[PDB]
Design a protein around this ligand. Structure first.
Ligand SMILES: Nc1ncnc2c1ncn2[C@@H]1O[C@H](COP(=O)(O)OP(=O)(O)O)[C@@H](O)[C@H]1O
Ligand SMILES: Nc1ncnc2c1ncn2[C@@H]1O[C@H](COP(=O)(O)OP(=O)(O)O)[C@@H](O)[C@H]1O
Ligand SMILES: [Zn+2]
Lengths: 92, 566, 96, 49
């Protein structure tokens, strides 16, 4: 039944985090952040909204959507790079 | 009653005039002088002479077109008397070729007109046209012109007749396969393939991969399984305002930049990559030396890209722009291993030569995706085709050479997660270095982190997910940032057909100075030809009669941006 | 369904109910939960489509119940097809 | 020439493991997955699949 839709009000919340995540990729780590990560964030964001049976994407769902994708990307890095990235993304 | 039909066609051939010549009678006379028993008749002149005979042919060609063949045989016999076998009739028409998806039961046994590309041709076979038979019981001799022998003697038991081989005549038959033009292929749909058969002198006129126009007889032969086919009757293979439009466009000084931006406007950056693709589409020039050395005019480009750098989109856009383009990915090709093959079609039980993806693109461009993960033995045929423009196929006791004059657009993933500038490309790209030596220009599309570029890309994703991308197409068109894809495709065919530039002596000595100074610092002699092909590519875009030294700077720079990129 | 949909901590009730008899591994359980609900597929006309399915890779040392998770997903999901790397073949996956 | 009747919303439902012998020569409603599908060809003509 549920096909939750995006709000353009959250465009800033999405684009700014992506650019911030991209900036740290060249700063530290060998894995370059790709557009497919952003494509993954929107998908899991839609899935989180689909959990609440709400037809529109909320800011709360995006925060948890950002948390899951960033955490997986950080945890897959080597130990030396892993500790640097955890401090840089303490907000997320 | 049928005598009037024979007489009507007799008068039509003998008396029709075009360019003050009795073209149908004259060409038949010329064929007799050449000693070939063929004739070609245009349908647009058949309707002009008399609509009645045209309407009868269009409605019931099953028995009327045999009458036309017999009538012209009488006409040829009459012609031979003045100068002191059954002749073939070929039909050509200029009417609209109805799409292959549109033929229906109402057109069964009616004259139809179609167009498509020939994907496969079969071996020749013998067919009977005139026979002489004798009764085994009473030795009664007679002649016969699906025909079957009489079950009872005409003078003896059932099936008394046998065939006299030394007093009979036979004709040649070829079976072919055709499918619709890729310009009309729907998305998510397999193109409609069609079975076509031709006989006598229409055989062996085409090779697989040829675009042709078809006029023939759509028919069906044998829970009630049935299969359609076409009895081939004839095969055929720019506006002044458009010619002058591009001629005026040739004098536009900003044409190079305008065309560059039109190449995938939805993508950001990679401006010089767009210029290379234009040079790939424009291509170089081919020349033949008297000593047997043929110069490859095709230009091949490799796009080494990191994952997520829109490498899939780069090749995807080119296929819709290039007039002759085919997309290949994961060893997948036009029902073949990228090359020609011999396969047996069970419908006619015959063996057919089938053209692969690189076969269909003779004189065009091919897009190869996932280049690093293809079959190595396929690379060898590609390697020969990339340099000698030929594909070699061996079957049992015969070896055949097939022409493939195709430019190659290739994209590949490096050995590691990203190309490392500290190493030569031969230790970074994930396939054979021998092929790496064959590409004219290779580029590494980059993913340098930039704020405005990433943000603009990021918003583009949400726009698609919000449906605003459809409105973006109108916004981009209103901005005038792109030439129409159909018009650009027309232009590529236009320049490929109208212009063939040559290098100027000043450009040549400029190239010599550049090459010597490069090697003084350091590149092979093979890549000298690759650079020169670019010089002809720029001149062809401008349709200049000769190349100019002002083309050299961009040609050197683009190649410098390619080879020194790695 | 509507009543629970607006309850407090609906997302936490869903995730904490994935594989009840498996301890911890909450970053997997949240990944299992998201893969069950999935996203929204999109198909722009005259352009390419976008998938909505969520792909999960479970890499870990022996133990940690990676296999038992796939056994729980098999029963809870609507249409689940279970395969194994060695027991499957190229023909047995694509077509026959 | 003909009007083939399409029944809809038939209430009784059977699975592929419940088709008893008594259900022969009777109207049944079952649910499943399309694994194998043949082409379209005329039958003694009208279409068949
Ligand atoms: N410069 C760019 N302009 C527009 N879209 C881009 C750009 N760079 C990346 N993208 C986006 O990133 C995605 C890249 O995916 P793609 O390269 O096709 O995957 P793969 O690397 O597996 O082939 C595309 O969907 C595209 O929309
Ligand atoms: N994190 C865990 N919490 C509780 N039980 C576990 C956990 N990991 C493994 N087990 C126990 O081990 C078994 C799973 O083993 P197995 O499926 O072979 O793991 P894997 O296949 O990932 O090596 C289960 O029966 C479960 O009882
Ligand atoms: Zn006899």
């Amino acid at each position: 039944k549920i096909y939750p839709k995006l709000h353009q009000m959250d465009m800033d919340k999405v684009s700014r985090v992506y650019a911030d995540l991209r900036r740290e990729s060249i700063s530290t780590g060998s894995f370059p952040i790709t557009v497919r990560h952003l494509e993954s964030i929107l998908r899991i964001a839609e899935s989180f909204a689909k959990m609440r049976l709400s037809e529109f994407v909320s800011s709360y769902d995006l925060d948890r959507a950002i948390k899951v994708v960033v955490d997986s990307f950080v945890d897959a890095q080597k130990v030396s790079v892993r500790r640097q990235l955890r401090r840089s993304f303490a907000i997320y | 009653d049928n005598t009037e039909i024979i007489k009507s066609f007799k008068n039509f051939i003998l008396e029709f005039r075009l360019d003050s010549q009795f073209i149908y009678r004259d060409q038949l006379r010329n064929n007799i002088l050449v000693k070939n028993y063929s004739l070609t008749v245009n349908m647009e002149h058949l309707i002009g002479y008399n609509e009645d005979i045209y309407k009868k042919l269009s409605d019931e060609p099953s028995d009327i077109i045999p009458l036309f063949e017999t009538a012209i045989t009488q006409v040829a016999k009459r012609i031979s008397i003045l100068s002191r076998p059954t002749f073939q009739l070929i039909l050509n028409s200029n009417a609209n070729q109805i799409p292959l998806r549109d033929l229906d039961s109402e057109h069964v046994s009616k004259i139809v007109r179609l167009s498509g590309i020939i994907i496969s041709t079969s071996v020749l076979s013998s067919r009977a046209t005139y026979l002489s038979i004798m009764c085994r019981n009473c030795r009664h001799t007679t002649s016969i012109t699906t025909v079957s022998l009489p079950r009872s003697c005409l003078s003896c038991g059932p099936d008394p007749y046998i065939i006299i081989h030394e007093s009979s005549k036979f004709i040649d038959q070829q079976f072919l396969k055709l499918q619709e033009i890729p310009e009309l292929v729907p998305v998510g749909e397999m193109p409609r393939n069609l079975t076509m058969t031709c006989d006598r002198y229409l055989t062996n006129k085409v090779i697989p991969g040829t675009r042709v126009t078809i006029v023939g007889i759509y028919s069906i032969y044998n829970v009630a399984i049935r299969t359609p086919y076409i009895k081939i009757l004839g095969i055929q293979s720019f506006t002044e305002e458009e010619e002058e439009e591009f001629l005026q466009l040739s004098r536009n000084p900003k044409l190079y930049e305008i065309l560059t931006n039109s190449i995938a406007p939805s993508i950001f950056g990679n401006e010089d990559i767009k210029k290379a693709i234009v040079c790939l589409l424009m291509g170089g020039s081919k020349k033949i030396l008297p000593d047997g050395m043929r110069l490859r005019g095709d230009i091949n480009v490799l796009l080494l890209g990191d994952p997520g750098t829109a490498k899939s989109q780069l090749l995807k856009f080119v296929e819709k722009v290039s007039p002759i383009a085919v997309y290949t990915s994961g060893k997948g090709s036009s029902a073949a291993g990228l090359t020609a093959s011999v396969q047996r079609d069970p419908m006619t039980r015959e063996f057919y030569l089938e053209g692969g993806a690189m076969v269909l693109a003779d004189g065009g461009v091919v897009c190869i995706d996932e280049f690093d993960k293809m079959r190595d033995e396929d690379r060898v045929a590609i390697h020969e085709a990339m340099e000698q423009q030929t594909i070699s196929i061996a079957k049992a006791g015969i070896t055949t050479v097939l022409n493939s004059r195709t430019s190659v657009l290739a994209a590949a993933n490096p050995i590691y997660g990203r190309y490392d500038d500290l190493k030569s490309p031969g230790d970074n790209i994930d396939f054979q270095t021998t092929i790496l030596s064959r590409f004219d220009m290779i580029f590494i599309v980059k993913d340098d982190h930039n704020e405005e570029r990433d943000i603009s890309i990021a918003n583009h994703v949400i726009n698609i997910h919000t449906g605003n991308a459809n409105a973006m197409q109108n916004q981009q068109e209103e901005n005038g940032s792109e030439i129409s894809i159909e018009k650009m495709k027309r232009y590529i065919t236009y320049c490929r057909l109208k212009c063939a530039p040559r290098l100027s002596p000043q450009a040549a000595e400029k190239l010599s100075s550049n090459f010597v100074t490069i090697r003084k610092q350091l590149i092979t002699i093979r890549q000298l030809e690759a650079i020169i092909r670019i010089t002809e590519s720029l001149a062809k875009l401008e349709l200049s009669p000769i190349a100019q030294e002002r083309h050299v700077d961009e040609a050197i720079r683009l190649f410098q941006a390619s080879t020194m990129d790695a | 369904f509507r009543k629970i949909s607006r309850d407090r901590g609906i997302i936490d009730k869903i995730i904490s109910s994935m594989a009840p008899s498996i301890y911890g591994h909450r970053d997997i359980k949240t990944a299992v939960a998201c893969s069950l609900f999935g996203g929204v597929p999109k198909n722009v006309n005259g352009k390419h489509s976008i998938r909505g399915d969520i792909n999960v890779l479970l890499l870990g040392d022996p133990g940690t119940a990676k296999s038992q998770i796939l056994k729980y997903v098999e029963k809870t999901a609507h249409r689940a097809v279970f395969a194994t790397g060695q027991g499957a073949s190229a023909v047995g996956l694509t077509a026959s | 020439s003909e009007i083939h009747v399409r029944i809809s919303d038939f209430p009784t439902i059977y699975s592929l493991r419940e088709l008893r012998e008594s259900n022969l020569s009777s109207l049944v409603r079952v649910t499943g997955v399309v694994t194998r599908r043949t082409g379209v060809f005329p039958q003694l003509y009208r279409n068949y699949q």
